[PDB]
Amino acid sequence: TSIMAVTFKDGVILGADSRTTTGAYIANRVTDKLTRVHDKIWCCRSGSAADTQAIADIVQYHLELYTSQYGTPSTETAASVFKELCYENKDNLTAGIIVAGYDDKNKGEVYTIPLGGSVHKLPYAIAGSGSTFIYGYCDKNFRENMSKEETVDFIKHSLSQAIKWDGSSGGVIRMVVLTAAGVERLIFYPDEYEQL
Amino acid sequence: TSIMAVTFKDGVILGADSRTTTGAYIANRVTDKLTRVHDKIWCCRSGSAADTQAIADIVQYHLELYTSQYGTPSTETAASVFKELCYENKDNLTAGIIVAGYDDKNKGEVYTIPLGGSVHKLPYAIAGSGSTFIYGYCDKNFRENMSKEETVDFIKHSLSQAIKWDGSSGGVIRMVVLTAAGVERLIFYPDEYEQL
Amino acid sequence: SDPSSINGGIVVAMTGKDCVAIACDLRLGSQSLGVSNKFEKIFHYGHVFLGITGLATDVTTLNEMFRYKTNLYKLKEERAIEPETFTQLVSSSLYERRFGPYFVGPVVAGINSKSGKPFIAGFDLIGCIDEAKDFIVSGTASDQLFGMCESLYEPNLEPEDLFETISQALLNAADRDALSGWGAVVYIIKKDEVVKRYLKMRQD
Amino acid sequence: TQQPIVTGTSVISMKYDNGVIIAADNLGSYGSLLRFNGVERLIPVGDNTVVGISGDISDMQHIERLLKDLVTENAYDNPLADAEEALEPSYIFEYLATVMYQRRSKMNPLWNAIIVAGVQSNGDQFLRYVNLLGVTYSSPTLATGFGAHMANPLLRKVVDRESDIPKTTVQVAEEAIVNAMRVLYYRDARSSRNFSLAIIDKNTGLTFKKNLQVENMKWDFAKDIKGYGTQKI
Amino acid sequence: QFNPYGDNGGTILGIAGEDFAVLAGDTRNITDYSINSRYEPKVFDCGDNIVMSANGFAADGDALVKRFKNSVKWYHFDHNDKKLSINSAARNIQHLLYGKRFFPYYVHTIIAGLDEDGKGAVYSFDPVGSYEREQCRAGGAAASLIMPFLDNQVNFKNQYEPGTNGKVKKPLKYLSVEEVIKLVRDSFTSATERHIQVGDGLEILIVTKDGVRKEFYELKRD
Amino acid sequence: TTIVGVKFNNGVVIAADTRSTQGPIVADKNCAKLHRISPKIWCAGAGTAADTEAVTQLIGSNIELHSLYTSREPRVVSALQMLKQHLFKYQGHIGAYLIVAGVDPTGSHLFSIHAHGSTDVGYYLSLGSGSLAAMAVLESHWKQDLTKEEAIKLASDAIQAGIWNDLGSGSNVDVCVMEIGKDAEYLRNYLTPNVREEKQKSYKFPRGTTAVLKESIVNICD
Amino acid sequence: GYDRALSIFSPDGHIFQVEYALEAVKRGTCAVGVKGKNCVVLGCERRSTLKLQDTRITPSKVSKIDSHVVLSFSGLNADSRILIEKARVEAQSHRLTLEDPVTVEYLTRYVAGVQQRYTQS
Amino acid sequence: YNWX
Amino acid sequence: TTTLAFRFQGGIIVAVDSRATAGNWVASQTVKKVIEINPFLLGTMAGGAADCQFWETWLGSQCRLHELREKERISVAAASKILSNLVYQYKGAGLSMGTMICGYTRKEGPTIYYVDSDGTRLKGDIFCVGSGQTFAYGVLDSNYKWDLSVEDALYLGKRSILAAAHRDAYSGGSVNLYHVTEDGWIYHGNHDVGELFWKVKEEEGSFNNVIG
Amino acid sequence: MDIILGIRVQDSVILASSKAVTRGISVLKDSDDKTRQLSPHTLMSFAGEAGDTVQFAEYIQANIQLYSIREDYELSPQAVSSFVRQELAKSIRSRRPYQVNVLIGGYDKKKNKPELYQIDYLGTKVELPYGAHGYSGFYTFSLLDHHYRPDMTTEEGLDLLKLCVQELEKRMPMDFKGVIVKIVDKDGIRQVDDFQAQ
Amino acid sequence: MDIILGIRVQDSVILASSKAVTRGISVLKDSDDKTRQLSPHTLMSFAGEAGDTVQFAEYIQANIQLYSIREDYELSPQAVSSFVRQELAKSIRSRRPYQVNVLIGGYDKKKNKPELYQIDYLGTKVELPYGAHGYSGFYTFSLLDHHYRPDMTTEEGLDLLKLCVQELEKRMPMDFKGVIVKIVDKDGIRQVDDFQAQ
């Protein structure tokens, strides 16, 4: 699995591949690892499928209920819920999650919760087995306050590499754009990303 | 340990960090992982310090005796030696080595012998714990037939990164240049490579 | 399962003023069972003494071994072997089996016929020589013995006095060790003479 | 029953005539991969106490929340919050200590080594350590993980025994600490260059320094070294 | 896997004279090979003229002490400031300890003071409650070293009266407080020489009808 | 064990503590950790006591011979290669961690050898359980162009670091100095900062204290 | 959950529910027992409000608590059964742990204590 | 063996 | 540890060593291995010191309660079964104790029961328990006769321990003797094996292989 | 393990049981009665782990004596055993199973016929002419298979057991110090005080 | 393990050894002679693992008879034993150590005095008045320690053993089917055909 979230001028972009394996067999080549927990707060899933799906569903609830009672939820909160679930149930979970969202007051924000159950806010984050291979590229090509077009590229490249090297990753690249104007679903096929 | 070898117009360049560790302790911070096996044939050492030093020492002999009898050895040969050792004694060794040399007929050539004992010839090769983090950058920034000045850079960056993410690596960067004009000893300190 | 502890036993030796002493207990058992109370652990080859704690069969063997080796030495050199020397022989003889040691802990004491300075030394199961100009211990009650010694000892004691000292250290240390005791012997050494005395002690 | 994941290395500290000093880098290692580079491991509690934590980070973040709690809950029905009934290091320590031990006894420990450093109401310096085992100790210098082995030896050359405390000055102390940090950068493969440091003086109060870096490093010699023995070039 | 225990080394010792009792312990605290502190007391005063030490695993050590001190507190409350006799403090601790018979306090503990008839006394415990009143006892790392010495210089074991053809034991005279301290210091210096865990310092708590006195001597810090 | 080596302007020096230990009990309060390989090639070692001595002699021997057969003064790199190939041969079972240095026709030299057979070179090194302590000091006070006297302090300071802060090390400090044109000097017990304070009492037992059952003399000469 | 205090005290110091139970006794058939020098006897009258019973089975007024101890009562036949069973059990629970059948005072002190409990629970 |  | 208790004419005999060990370590030579339950009941210790000391001191309490509860002295059969049943509750938890419960009651006569952490309870006449049991059993069986005199009997035990102490490295220190009659129990000294062995050797003439 | 045997003749049931209690290295008692009278015409013998053995048998005793009282009646063997099987089968999936095997034999005063039941620690029950537990059966069954007959007089049975015990004494590693025999018939239960030789 | 006992009186040495070979579940033989005559004035009894036991004894027999011939002389016990110790001590560090314990008793026609040597599988030798191997010693020693005397007639010894065997037959878990006793003295070696009762 190869996933990352990047914050930019207009807001934020999450991207991931689409491969779920059970060993070295490809169970699902079209998986959507970008899950919605709210109109404008999403997450990228890495680790055990089940553990992740379950954790996510439980957060969509906790937020849906938050909403009804107190309006639109902040991202710091969306994270807190995740952290809580992951940290509190550490012995039985193997899920590393990246939360990304868009607020009118805070623009874009990215939080990452790694296996331990810690929460980290940062300009960008990557995770998934395939991420070992791009700590280099990314730290090297990432500039703060990029444009949508620029960011989709950065992401498109970083991951294409990750897919190149890690066999636990492949399929297609998926991205989701979070901005004032809305929510956009972007997809990229092999024939494009491979030769770059 | 992070090491790599890159071939270019004028010849080839070997580069490595300078950290040998025992568990999490830094035993030696100025180690030389670039070992000579002949006037114009060198290698990069990663893995067990014992196993590598030994394997090199045995090669130097094997080639020095080769010379006496049959003149300056080709690199394909320097490699076959290593292969023979690494493959034949696989159960007792944990050493991955990269061999780099310069001939007047073949220019620069790079071979890599990974834990298994297979030999691989390629434009460039990287290895060691810290290599995991640059398959990306490198595959993205390497261009064939670069100039010396360009290569030292490519190499300086790739490793500087590896040193950043992998703690089994650090210290200083060492490079060795192999061309018709001779043999040059390059070294690079922290205060320079860290902020690039 | 700890070979060094099946049989049990203790040995100690101390230096005095122009004299040295070495002693040991007479127990020989198997785990909890006491079997023999006449297992002397101090052997002598000429004017050099060596006591051996540890596995009984090895004690026996090594003893036999050094008789042999010391005998040839005297023939080949037409002179009786000296401590300083004998020690080195012991060390090498043990390390010779560095990867499958004799589970023992030899202790050596005697005097140089030529120079007169008293000499004592001990080793771990593989030959590391422990040279100390004061006292050496070995056996299941090593911890105890050390304790006794380090407290009781003072430099330059006379034959009559040193005897008291070593005896107590043995005796007392033995009494706090389940695997040691059942008797005890003490050797007092002087350039010309050597006396062997047996002690009265608990039999439990 | 657990195994730490994201971790933070050494924490060093020593006390001096007018207070205490403590420091720790800003790193969170995910095993051998030096993952996070902007981690503050020095947690201030009020204006008279700093708690430094090494070990598992997730748990640290918890001990963070626990503290902010301790703070709030003390102000409650306490008119003397910002004065005579404010939290004292001894309180903060004894609590944490209590917690750590309860957790080891329940077999679900907080994988940490924590040094609580500060000054009391009456002025006395305070420095004590508690780790995942509820083991508690105090000494003129304290440290966790590697620092244990390397920092202590250095810092102890300044304050060998209690009597040396009233003889050591901030400048001296701070130099020592910084150094230890440097050395640690040389040897700890899990350390980082960017660190943090803070002092707690019975007069100036609390001073906290962020974004510190190691300087005055000696690396030039590495040029005269080649091969591993017989190599000449 | 998480191992819930540690070993801070250390060593302690208690001797009881006709009308006083002593309890000492080194002041070093270790972990594997490093030294945690050269001065961390482990012999405490719990009120009611009772000194006590729990040597073994520090944490478990500090705990017991806490639980006991507190017990004493509640004793007074629940019994009109009645003074807790040592023989009683003993039985209490047996209960504290055995309370955890299946997750023991990894400590060898000793306490000392005066009994009802005013004579001095000492009791030592198994890390799970076996208790007995004894003349003297050493415990911890160097217990194996020092115990023998005591059996000798205190209970006069194996010593005999000169010239009696080994048929008369040295009469059991009783050590003066001053003479007792001598033994302690020596027992410690000797311990320091052969035990890497022992060293740094010696803190001695002394007990008499007049209260509780403390004495401190330096040791080899190597 | 704490051993170090420091190179200086026209020579090299090495040092070490003197505590030998079986587990946590000091076995030799002043055992020698410096070994003479050849007159001007000295080696220092940590690990299993036996192996540091053995591998040192065995090579000192094979070297001595080698020299005679070549009518030349020995070379460090020789001792080195000799040591390493042997250790490596033994897959690490020979617990010898050695710091080897000396002077020979080619100049001065300093190296280190780990029991698995890997070598390192540098201007200062240390090894042993006290490794970290000293190394701290070294990294704290070293500089290039050290004189004979500045270096000796340096190497000394470093050992002291080990002694004080490492239970596995202690007692005295041994130093050896090898300069380019002079004979080598072996300074055994350069420092003795751990002397035993006079004991408090003398246990000189009145004679007769011990009970004897049988008494005899022994026959030595033939 | 039901725990209302039914046996409480009233202004004059009597516990109604208890005193009332007594009255229930007064309505049950009589029963008697008297002891000799080497034996004891128990007698009882049979309720004749409804007649045409089968003696063979009907709970005999005298029940065996153990091969050596009996119990008879006057009161709500039903209540007796509970008392008897609780008693028979303690009869074995005692043999089993003391290796000796119950003395009559004990058995009694048991049954009674059982009764007392029900007057303040 | 001895450490040583 | 070697403990023994046996039955005859003038009552019951009980003797035990006084050594406790932590492996090879002699933790103590001055251990009381006989719990004075109450003026008429006695228990012996073998197995873990604490487990024994604690649970017997405890038995003492459950006994005192029974007395107040029925104004009658508790039987040994009962006093034993209490401990027994207790111990069986904790079965499998790691308790290690082998003990004898000895007493004289108007109802049962003199009686002894074996009770161990395994949960076995046995009524018997002679019993030895401990690492050194075998050695004592030896001496007993051969010299036991129901017609023994209290003077003789006390000796037979003292000796039987002595036998065991000599051989079994885990036993020894000193011997604590006890005699049981309806008027309660009577102590018969703490004999240091240090001084006792020799005396016996000389007078009886045995332990000849020893030299002295 | 210890020895437990049973044999049902025409008008009775005989149970034999080793008289020894061994522990680790020593034989602690040479006169153990490994049996309990459940009800005046029902006897149960047992063999198994140390405590569980007695503990279990005494429990069944209580629980049966209790019924006998509550009802002024005596349960038939087919019933007592069934109860016992349920109690055992109940515990096998318990936290700490009773590790006991029992042989139960009684006389059915109502059917006026004798009966013997074998049940192992798992609650395996089965009615049989003769039976045994543990290793014992291994030597004895052959003998019984051979020399047994339904219309056997009681005397004929005691001789058969003797023949059995003899074999066991001849070929069995451990010394069980002889047996204790008991006969269950219309007149109740009686112990044969003469089996050390007959 | 089997039973091996020995006791040296004033004018001889007596050896007692159980007569049973047990295999897993059965007792295969009730009449084993666990001993071999090394030389006309020396006997060795043995106990240990299934096969090593005889193999080792017969080997020692051979190597000793051989010496007896090559020199027209009989080796002293102190020697025969020392020989045996070395053979054992040799094997302990071999591919498959002989797992046998032996008792050796002989009469020294030269010193005119009897001797008994005990040596365990590791080559641990020691001279003793009486000895035993395995667990047997656990029960007997106390007796011997007690009822033993250097100036004992031969008759006094056999009774002593009898008293020993007795203790064993009473307190030992496994039935060893009795013993076979043999005495070694100036006139040679003889087997006491009467010990099933004396």
Ligand SMILES: [Mg+2]
């Ligand atoms: Mg792919």
Ligand SMILES: [Mg+2]
């Ligand atoms: Mg004993």
Ligand SMILES: [Mg+2]
């Ligand atoms: Mg009181």
Ligand SMILES: [Mg+2]
């Ligand atoms: Mg010390």
